[PDB]
Write a protein that binds this ligand. Structure first.
Ligand SMILES: N#C[C@@]1(c2ccc3c(N)ncnn23)O[C@H](CO)[C@@H](O)[C@H]1O
Length: 170
């Protein structure tokens, strides 16, 4: 379990790889894969769509059932559900959607959920269709998470920008 390779070490607990999080999950079968979710766990596109498609919609069926019960998540919150064929657990984490003016302060709350798990395979939160500054999201991740997070960034342009920015932060 958790046999990650090819990651660049940024800090003592944050690693980054240019890779598809679904392919990483299939190769490693991590204890926890993080989903970049919305409050209804509607896994339409991006990371959520990729993860759900890999489960042939089992993640969505499970998610629809959770929401039908406990109601939607809060922005900045999370829930632990099955990892299906990708991982033992999936931590669905809701970062703020700044395309909707959701408070960017909730990005720190979002990353704080990672601290409930020893080791996570995760995407960068609130970027892509959530619209947040991805350098900012990396900075909040590095500043906030206390446990071991392995970040999988599919987009090579974004990956190179993130790594170049991290080298210039310190
Ligand atoms: N890069 C990237 C993305 C993304 C989309 C789809 C995937 C995937 N399959 N694996 C990893 N990353 N990934 O992750 C961030 C999620 O907030 C945004 O920048 C997205 O554009």
């Amino acid at each position: 379990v958790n046999s990650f390779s090819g990651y660049l070490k940024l800090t003592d607990n944050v690693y980054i790889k240019n890779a598809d999080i679904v392919e990483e999950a299939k190769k490693v079968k991590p204890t926890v894969v993080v989903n970049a979710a919305n409050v209804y766990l509607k896994h339409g596109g991006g990371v959520a769509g990729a993860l759900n498609k890999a489960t042939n919609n089992a993640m969505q069926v499970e998610s629809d059932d959770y929401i039908a019960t406990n109601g939607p998540l809060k922005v900045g919150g999370s829930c632990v559900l099955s990892g299906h064929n990708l991982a033992k657990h999936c931590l669905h984490v809701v970062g703020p959607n700044v395309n909707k003016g959701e408070d960017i302060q909730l990005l720190k709350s979002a990353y704080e959920n990672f601290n409930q798990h020893e080791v996570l395979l995760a995407p960068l939160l609130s970027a892509g269709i959530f619209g947040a500054d991805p350098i900012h999201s990396l900075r909040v991740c590095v500043d906030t998470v206390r446990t071991n997070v392995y970040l999988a960034v599919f987009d090579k342009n974004l990956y190179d920008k993130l790594v170049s920015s991290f080298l210039e932060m310190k």
